[PDB]
Ligand binder design. Structure first.
Ligand SMILES: [Mg+2]
Ligand SMILES: [Mg+2]
Ligand SMILES: [Mg+2]
Ligand SMILES: [Mg+2]
Ligand SMILES: [Mg+2]
Ligand SMILES: [Mg+2]
Ligand SMILES: [Mg+2]
Ligand SMILES: [Mg+2]
Ligand SMILES: [Mg+2]
Ligand SMILES: [Mg+2]
Ligand SMILES: [Mg+2]
Ligand SMILES: [Mg+2]
Ligand SMILES: [Mg+2]
Ligand SMILES: [Mg+2]
Ligand SMILES: [Mg+2]
Ligand SMILES: [Mg+2]
Ligand SMILES: [Mg+2]
Ligand SMILES: [Mg+2]
Ligand SMILES: [Mg+2]
Ligand SMILES: [Mg+2]
Ligand SMILES: [Mg+2]
Ligand SMILES: [Mg+2]
Ligand SMILES: [Mg+2]
Ligand SMILES: [Mg+2]
Ligand SMILES: [Mg+2]
Ligand SMILES: [Mg+2]
Ligand SMILES: [Mg+2]
Ligand SMILES: [Mg+2]
Lengths: 67, 107, 223, 96, 57
RNA sequence: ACGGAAGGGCACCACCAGGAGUGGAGCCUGCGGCUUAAUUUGACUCAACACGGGGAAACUCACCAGGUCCAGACACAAUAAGGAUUGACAGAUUGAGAGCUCUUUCUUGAUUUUGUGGGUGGUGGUGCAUGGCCGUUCUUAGUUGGUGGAGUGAUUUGUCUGCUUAAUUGCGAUAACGAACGAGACCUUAACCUACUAAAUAGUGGUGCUAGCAUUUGCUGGUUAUCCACUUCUUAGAGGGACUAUCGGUUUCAAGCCGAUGGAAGUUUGAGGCAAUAACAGGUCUGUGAUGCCCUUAGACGUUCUGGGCCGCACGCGCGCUACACUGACGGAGCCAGCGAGUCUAACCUUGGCCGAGAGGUCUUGGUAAUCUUGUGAAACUCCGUCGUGCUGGGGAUAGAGCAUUGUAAUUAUUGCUCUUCAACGAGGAAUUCCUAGUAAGCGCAAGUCAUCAGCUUGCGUUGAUUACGUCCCUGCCCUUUGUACACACC
């Protein structure tokens, strides 16, 4: 399966909480953001993070998301 | 008054690439920054040593094995300098972990 | 001479291993904590990371003399070609080894099992560790073996960071009834790391924005 | 042990002249590096010389590392007759 | 040790670490015979130290 | 904690749909058994039985038949320079050119001897005294603290009906909120870079120099430097890349899951490394100069030396190997891999040249190795033949004779070759293992062991499927619920 862990979704949350001006529906540029806008540690985990901050960003456009 | 083109090959061999790449490019630019004629670090196959053993001191248990390994990295850089800078380049540039071997000769 | 870099690089490891061995015996009561041997033009340099180099040295410079001579004679170094230097070590609080033979030389010194270990953990934590763990396996005063854990604060157990941040050491303390197992774990604060990553791969900090005062209709500045 | 005084002195001499001795755990080595006697002579000579104080013994990877004490120094001082302020390797070489 | 006395462990265990910062802070300042042996066997190497004569028939 | 209660799940060490088999045979090999001077010993459900890296000719070695030595520290005593003690030639003796022992009679010089006390070695005991290590539970998903809610209290809630995941993985529900250990992240490996830095120990094109065939220009080679240039291939540095992306279905439109397109890659990307808390009288005192205690300690359980033994054979068991053929055996012929490894105070990996049917020999030679062996021209396999279903040319056990190699030693036959001898076995009862994609199965290799010996193991690559993509039937274990008079916890 590919259920993303809590650290992924946790960081994702509070990224979307304070940087909605900036970010998009584009993973590619949401990625580049995370380098500047946060400190991660891994090339992998950073995509795995940015990917899911991008998913949320996507659905929020069609109605709210809890948390 | 000394000095003469002496045609030199420096083998660098170690097991810690950070130190080893340190010492490699450090040598390549320090000696180049004052203008020479060279063939830059030639990485040879990082070869790996293997030891493959049973974990158990004795005989009991399911048969778990557990191979250790050791990574040997070796590099050579071809230089053409005169006597002074040679020995200037070898005595220092030392590093606790990197075997330096500076040979001579076109034979 | 004349070896192969294969049989060489291994051989050098053996040399380390045997050297570190012989020191760990011959210099316990001085908190020996490891070596490192420097392979130079001219010399072979050996640095004796013990906490207490005064008793490595001895009267106007003997003992280290004895030790060289020993180390010398054995591996058939010619006088001069090999050289030893003792060196105290920047706090023993984060050397697993330092605390291991602490305890040996604590319990063996006729002292409680709780007092010994618990003190040890506290010194290690006061030494600025992120976390520490101590284990006493063995048999003590009663004849069935038992085993106690002593551990304060934070430690991790899996993955690569293992290698990077925790320091393990077992030591065999040899008492009248039987022998125990002292086993120590010190975890150094990752934020201090110097040469390495300065955080767990779990570390993901968000940097905090800034209070914007927006609006203000257009306008431009000239220079 | 049973050994001629020749082989005795050579050791005891060597120990004073050096202070330190090493010897791989092998017997039947006929003659060992440095001290010109039977290997077995070295070890059981020292070992004796130890259990009367005088010299510290240590083992590790099959090899015996011997440290002369201070009280032993005085003993070698006797068995060789040599006067006080003699030697041992308790000097600091030239300027080494 | 029983858990009936474990308070008095931690205390006595603490003071142990107290003195172990005392000793390591007090260690953050704190406070000829010539001759040799190969040179005395060559010094007293002058003779009057043996004898030799025999072999007959 | 347990139950021979109930409820949910999880898994090719469970089954389903299938495959390849073992179980039958011959042999190889381990275990039992018996036999024996001795046939050293550990271990016996998964989790003992090609396991102790256990492929034992001496060694190893623990066993048996005999023979030497003290390597019995140190302390006191006894002896004693008129000699405390050491050694031996020949002879006898002995398996022995052991002065073991005796004849004999020199030598030796306080190093020993005799006595106690005190040590010492020990593959002797105890793994039910221990350390350490390991195996198992575990192919698992569990563990804990801060603030808050309950309880006098141990305690509990958080940590949960559900759904979802490989996962206490998440979504959601919610007196909890929000977190940490473990899972994840991480690290190594195999995959992708005409982007970056380069290379006569890697390779390409051009050019010289040159062979062959064709000739019209061409085609196929040779030529460690005759030069020029490049990094696609190879090598390893630094970067990049994937995040299940895009879109669509399905779902509490939640986590997710499914499909198509794109993609080097979309099954935790494929495979590993690491791995919390706790349990076991799991195994290991026979790895350890790790250790307690017990035992022995000179007619030794010390140690070495000589020979035998661990292989002994009415038989029970297990891992294997080779087969029963015609999708084959044979014979020429094509001719293709990847992980490895190799000689200094030395005899390792070996090209090449002769000689020999062969095994091998002999002369040389390269390599401490991306440089030499080696392009490891490996094996299956591909091709043209010969055999024609007949225990046959399938099969190659048992056995005879001969020649070679390792080794101090080959008999109880170390291995190799040649001729001959030509068994059992016509697909294997009840049973039972392993397995979901470059996997299974077939196939050879290299490395460990190794003087010589692989029918073993650890990796490696070559050829390359069928059938699943499900369930809870059997089995196994986890989770609730519940009982308990157990808590040393159903041993
Ligand atoms: Mg973790
Ligand atoms: Mg992990
Ligand atoms: Mg089936
Ligand atoms: Mg079947
Ligand atoms: Mg097995
Ligand atoms: Mg024998
Ligand atoms: Mg005695
Ligand atoms: Mg006694
Ligand atoms: Mg032992
Ligand atoms: Mg046990
Ligand atoms: Mg144990
Ligand atoms: Mg037993
Ligand atoms: Mg499976
Ligand atoms: Mg309350
Ligand atoms: Mg619960
Ligand atoms: Mg490239
Ligand atoms: Mg596609
Ligand atoms: Mg038991
Ligand atoms: Mg053991
Ligand atoms: Mg056997
Ligand atoms: Mg054929
Ligand atoms: Mg012939
Ligand atoms: Mg040569
Ligand atoms: Mg045949
Ligand atoms: Mg036939
Ligand atoms: Mg082999
Ligand atoms: Mg084997
Ligand atoms: Mg109850």
């Amino acid at each position: 399966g590919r259920v993303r862990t809590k650290t992924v979704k946790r960081a994702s949350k509070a990224l979307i909480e304070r940087y909605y001006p900036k970010l998009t529906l584009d993973f590619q540029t949401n990625k580049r953001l995370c380098d500047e806008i946060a400190t991660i540690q891994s090339k992998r985990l950073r995509n795995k993070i940015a990917g899911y901050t991008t998913h949320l960003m996507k659905r929020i456009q069609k109605g709210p998301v809890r948390g | 008054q000394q000095q003469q083109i002496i045609k030199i090959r420096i083998t660098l061999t170690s097991t810690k690439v950070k130190q080893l790449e340190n010492v490699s490019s450090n040598i390549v630019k320090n000696a180049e920054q004052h203008n020479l004629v060279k063939k830059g670090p030639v990485r040879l196959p990082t070869k790996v040593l293997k030891i493959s053993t049973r974990k158990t001191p004795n005989g009991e248990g399911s048969k778990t094995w557990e191979t250790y390994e050791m990574r040997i990295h070796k590099r050579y850089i071809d230089l053409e300098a005169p006597v002074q800078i040679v020995k200037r380049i070898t005595q220092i540039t030392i590093e606790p972990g990197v075997d330096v071997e500076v040979v001579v000769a076109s034979n | 001479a004349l070896i192969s870099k294969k049989r060489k690089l291994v051989a050098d490891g053996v040399f380390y291993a045997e050297l570190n061995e012989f020191f760990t015996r011959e210099l316990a009561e001085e908190g020996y904590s490891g070596v490192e041997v420097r392979v130079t033009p001219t010399k072979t340099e050996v640095i004796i990371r013990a906490t207490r180099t005064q008793d490595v040295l001895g009267e106007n410079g003997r003992r280290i003399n004895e030790l060289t001579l020993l180390v010398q004679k054995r591996f058939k170094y010619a006088p001069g070609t090999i050289v030893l230097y003792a060196e105290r070590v920047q706090d023993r609080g984060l050397s697993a080894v330092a605390q291991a033979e602490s305890m040996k030389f604590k319990l063996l010194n006729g002292l409680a099992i709780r007092r010994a270990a618990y003190g040890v953990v506290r010194y290690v934590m006061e030494s600025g560790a992120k976390g520490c763990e101590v284990v006493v396996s063995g048999k003590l005063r009663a004849a069935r073996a038992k085993a106690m854990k002593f551990a304060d604060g934070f430690l991790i157990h899996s993955g690569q960071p293992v290698n990077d941040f925790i320091d393990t050491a077992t030591r065999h303390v040899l008492m009248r009834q039987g022998v125990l197992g002292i086993k120590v774990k010190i975890m150094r604060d990752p934020a201090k790391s110097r040469t390495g990553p300065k955080a767990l791969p779990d570390a993901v900090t968000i940097i905090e924005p800034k209070e914007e005062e927006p609006i203000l209709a257009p306008s431009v500045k000239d220079y | 042990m049973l050994m001629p005084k020749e082989d005795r002195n050579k050791i005891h001499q060597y120990l004073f002249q050096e202070g330190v001795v090493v010897a791989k755990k092998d017997f039947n080595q006929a003659k060992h590096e440095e001290i010109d006697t039977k290997n077995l002579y070295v070890i059981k000579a020292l070992q004796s010389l130890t259990s009367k104080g005088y010299v510290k013994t240590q083992f590790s990877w099959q090899y015996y590392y011997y440290t002369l004490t201070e009280e032993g120094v005085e003993y070698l001082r006797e068995y060789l007759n040599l006067p006080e302020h003699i030697v041992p390797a308790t000097y600091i070489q030239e300027r080494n | 040790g029983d858990d009936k006395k474990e308070l008095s462990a931690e205390k006595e265990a603490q003071a142990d670490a107290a003195a172990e910062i005392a000793e390591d802070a007090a260690e953050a300042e704190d406070a000829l015979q010539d001759y040799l042996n190969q040179q005395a066997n060559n010094q007293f190497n002058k003779v009057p130290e043996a004898k030799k004569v025999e072999l007959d028939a």
